[PDB]
Structure formats: structure tokens, C-alpha cells
């Protein structure tokens, strides 16, 4: 009598749209949300562009008084979390409140208000630090505010595993529901790292693309001309619900979450990933957790950060898991349009994987003009691909030098 976990609510902010549907429609059109940064001076920065949330307006959800106590990434998470709750139509009562929690994380956190508070410190001493510094920056405050404004008393965790946070938070929200500690969980991630310390940080590690002259073509996964990943802001939120609890209250049902896999690479990051044995181990554990064969997977929302080493390692992991049906399964990196949302990347890409089950369509990998000579795989390049019979999707968040996570979704 092991309980099944199902998805009943969606919410999202992304560089190509401020709702789930506008974002999804923008991706199917191959539209890029990457643009030049203008909220700080990028003169001395090697990367001057990122995937920004445009025309963000949370004034009707978060008052200006509370916005000052929130870093941008928390504001993104609350708005996306409110959208998911409103979409689920869930009615929180005094009786079911202790059965509803959250699992929302971030890879970086409140980098913008950390910079501001430390600037206040270096100029005026500790008396200039805001009393809201800590609650406005730590990664668990998205779950914090959401459990408060909806009256959630259930289990709430916050997984910060860098760019695996989104997949890890959703996967363990499902584990918490399967274990019986909760019937409903709001799970996802949120990121706003397009700051001087964020762009400078990854730029210091030489991991960022430098194609300032053409920001929309900089993110080119599996293309011979890639030169690093592109930062992206946003948030993704899902309302995860037990299957009987959902059908009983008459709930909208997007797809069933049937598999969750985890693994560690056990090499640093500068070491050559080569075979992607960690990535393949994560996908393998998720297939066994669901009890299906890799040949039943129709679409794979890849990690695909447009990194020279990372993309080649993920391609070898896909070849290892799929093998014979590798050249037939559809793989795609939505980061070609949105950029890398880091701790939220797994969250937004889980929704893309669910929507591919609903609309029977696959978003493309734009800017893939000429792939590696080492690959045959169908990366669904340039334009989206209509599909039929698609029943299982696979969402991957990899580290190529760290933690790995994989989620499998099933239709109906």
C-alpha cells in the first residue's frame, strides 16, 4: 500500500515568462530570455549578460514593507509558490494544516542583500547591518514565508545542493509524502545570482560564457562553439500531493512523479568527468525507483549547461543508460533559452518535463548549429518537436564534479 505522489499545481518565474504558460509557450517558440545586464556596472566584468526576470511585479502579493526584508530570490520563490498554490486550488484548513509542508531550496541564496549588508558593514560598522540581514538572505526563507502565509505546519526542509537543488527538493518532497509524513508538499527552487558577486564569482572560476557580442547565442549546449554557461534567474514551484488525497478533493492532476535517483561523482570538478558514471548512476537509480526500462523514456530534459566538458560527459551518460534506444530518445537542454537557473534549474525543468507530458511536445535546444563529432543523439535542435505516445519524461540535474539527481514523471 505504498502511497503514490502526483503533481497538482505549478508556478514559475523565468527569463522567458512570468507564468507557467507564457514561459512554456516562449520555449516552444525557441525564444531566448538572455539579455545585457544593466542593474550594475559590468565594465570590469568578463560576462555582461544573463537570463533576467523582466517586468517583475509582486506588489499585489508582497507589500513594499516586506519586500525590503527579502532578497530578490526569496521574492521570486514566494510569487512562484503562490502561483502553484492558487493553481492547485488547495483549501488549507485547521485540520489538514499539519499534513502540508514545503521542500524549497537554492544553490546560492540572498547574494544581493549579503553584498549590501557587507557594504554597509565595511562603511559604517556593525551598527549599519540590517536586523533583517539573516532572515533576508538564508536559503530556507522561501519555505519560511510560504509556510507562514498559507498556515503550513507540516514538514519543511530546504536542500541546497548547488545546481541539483531543484531536483533534490522535489524528489525528497515526494519521499516525505511517500513515507507518510505529509499529504501535500510545495517543492522547488529559486535563484537570483545575477549580482556582482555572482557574475564575478563564476567568472572568477572561468566557467561563464564570454559571448557579450551576442548574448542570445552564447548558451549553445553540445555545440563546438560553446565557452561556458549563462546565468539565469527565476523560480519553479510544484504542489506535490498524495494520489488518493488529490482525487478525493477533485484535484487538477498534471502528471505522476514515479522515480527519484541520486548519486555522487566522487571527483572534484577540475578532474575530467569523462564517462559521466555519476550522471548515469543517478538516472539508473531513478529508473529502478520507478521500475521501468530506459526505452520507455520519450524525453530527457538534460542538464546541458553549454559547458565544453559537462555536455560531453552528459552525452556519454545518456549513451550508457539508453544504449540501443539512445539515438531514438529525445534529449533537450532548455538552458539554451533560459540559461542556468542553478538551484532553481531542476525546479523549472521538472515543470517543462511535466508539460511535455501534457502537450505532447518537446522544447528545442537552440543555437545548436554543429554538434560534436562524438555524438549521434537527437538533441531536438532549433525547433520544437511534436510527439505522440510519450508516457515518461526524465529530468536531470548534474554536477560533473558533485551531486546528481534525476526525476521521472509519468502521464496521468
Amino acid at each position: 500500500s505504498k502511497r503514490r505522489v502526483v503533481v497538482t499545481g505549478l508556478g514559475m518565474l523565468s527569463p522567458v515568462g512570468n507564468t507557467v504558460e507564457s514561459t512554456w509557450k516562449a520555449l516552444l517558440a525557441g525564444q531566448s530570455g538572455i539579455s545585457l545586464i544593466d542593474h550594475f556596472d559590468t565594465s570590469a566584468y568578463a560576462t555582461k549578460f544573463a537570463g533576467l526576470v523582466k517586468d517583475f511585479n509582486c506588489e499585489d502579493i508582497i507589500s513594499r514593507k516586506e519586500q525590503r526584508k527579502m532578497d530578490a530570490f526569496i521574492q521570486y520563490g514566494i510569487v512562484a509558490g503562490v502561483q502553484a498554490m492558487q493553481d492547485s486550488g488547495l483549501e488549507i484548513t485547521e485540520e489538514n494544516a499539519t499534513r502540508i509542508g514545503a521542500a524549497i531550496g537554492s544553490g546560492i541564496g540572498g547574494l544581493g542583500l549579503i553584498e549590501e549588508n557587507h557594504t554597509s558593514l565595511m562603511n559604517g560598522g556593525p551598527r549599519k547591518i540590517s536586523p533583517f540581514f539573516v532572515p533576508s538572505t538564508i536559503v530556507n526563507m522561501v519555505a519560511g514565508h510560504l509556510t507562514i502565509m498559507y498556515g503550513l505546519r507540516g514538514p519543511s526542509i530546504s536542500i541546497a545542493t548547488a545546481c541539483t537543488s531543484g531536483v533534490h527538493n522535489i524528489g525528497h518532497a515526494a519521499r516525505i509524502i511517500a513515507y507518510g509524513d505529509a499529504d501535500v508538499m510545495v517543492a522547488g527552487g529559486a535563484e537570483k545570482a545575477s549580482t556582482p558577486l555572482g557574475v564575478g564569482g563564476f567568472g572568477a572560476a572561468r566557467a561563464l560564457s564570454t559571448r557579450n557580442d551576442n548574448p542570445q547565442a552564447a548558451s549553445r549546449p553540445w555545440d563546438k562553439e560553446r565557452d561556458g554557461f549563462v546565468l539565469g534567474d527565476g523560480a519553479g514551484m510544484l504542489v506535490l500531493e498524495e494520489y488518493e488525497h488529490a482525487k478525493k478533493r477533485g484535484a487538477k492532476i498534471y502528471a505522476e512523479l514515479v522515480g527519484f535517483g541520486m548519486s555522487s561523482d566522487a571527483y572534484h570538478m577540475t578532474s575530467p568527468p569523462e564517462n559521466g558514471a555519476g550522471a548515469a548512476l543517478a538516472m539508473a537509480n531513478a529508473l529502478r525507483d520507478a521500475g521501468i526500462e530506459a526505452s520507455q523514456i520519450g524525453y530527457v530534459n538534460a542538464h546541458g549547461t553549454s559547458t565544453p566538458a559537462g555536455d560531453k560527459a552528459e552525452a556519454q551518460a545518456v549513451k550508457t543508460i539508453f544504449g540501443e534506444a539512445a539515438s531514438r530518445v529525445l534529449v533537450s537542454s532548455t538552458k539554451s533559452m533560459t540559461g542556468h537557473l542553478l538551484g532553481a534549474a531542476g525546479a523549472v525543468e521538472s515543470i517543462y518535463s511535466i508539460l511535455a507530458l501534457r502537450d505532447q511536445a518537446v522544447p528545442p535546444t537552440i543555437n545548436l548549429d554543429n554538434p560534436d563529432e562524438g555524438c549521434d543523439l537527437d538533441f531536438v535542435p532549433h525547433e520544437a518537436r511534436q510527439v505522440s505516445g510519450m508516457e515518461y519524461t526524465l529530468c536531470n540535474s548534474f554536477g560533473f564534479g558533485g551531486t546528481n539527481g534525476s526525476l521521472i514523471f509519468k502521464k496521468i
Binding site: 513594499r64 514593507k65 551598527r127 549599519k128 540590517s130 536586523p131 533583517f132
Partner: protein, 77 residues
């Protein structure tokens, strides 16, 4: 550009209330919905606007709008 109205502007903006609600006898925590950390950042906002150091033992005695106006007026250091 008065000091009384500048103080009322910082208060109303800090606590998110229209300046008509920021009357003189209004209390921060009772009439304007401020929690403890709200009052602490409010005093800091007052310090930032007028370039004055307000001691912590004396800031705790600033609990209403009139109590605020009377302090910044008789100082300017």
C-alpha cells in the same frame, strides 16, 4: 521639508502606511503593526536620514510617532 514631516515620511514608508495614518499619538507596534525588528530598522532609518547616532538604551524609548519627533528635534548632532 520640515523635520516633523520628514520623520513622518520615514515612519510611514518603513511601516508601509499612508501618511494620514501616521498621526502623532500613533504607536509603532499597536497602531501601525510593527514588530520588534520593524522598530529596530525604523530607528536605523531615522539615523540614516539625519546622520545621528541614537543609543540603544534611548532608542527603546522611541515607541510612538510623537516620541520620535521629539528626539530628533532636540538633538541634530
Amino acid at each position: 521639508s520640515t523635520i516633523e514631516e520628514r520623520v513622518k515620511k520615514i515612519i510611514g514608508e518603513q511601516l508601509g502606511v499612508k501618511q494620514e495614518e501616521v498621526t502623532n499619538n500613533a504607536s509603532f507596534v499597536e497602531d501601525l503593526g510593527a514588530d520588534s525588528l520593524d522598530t529596530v530598522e525604523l530607528v536605523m532609518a531615522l539615523e540614516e536620514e539625519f546622520d545621528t547616532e541614537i543609543p540603544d538604551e534611548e532608542a527603546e524609548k522611541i515607541t510612538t510617532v510623537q516620541a520620535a519627533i521629539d528626539y530628533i528635534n532636540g538633538h541634530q548632532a
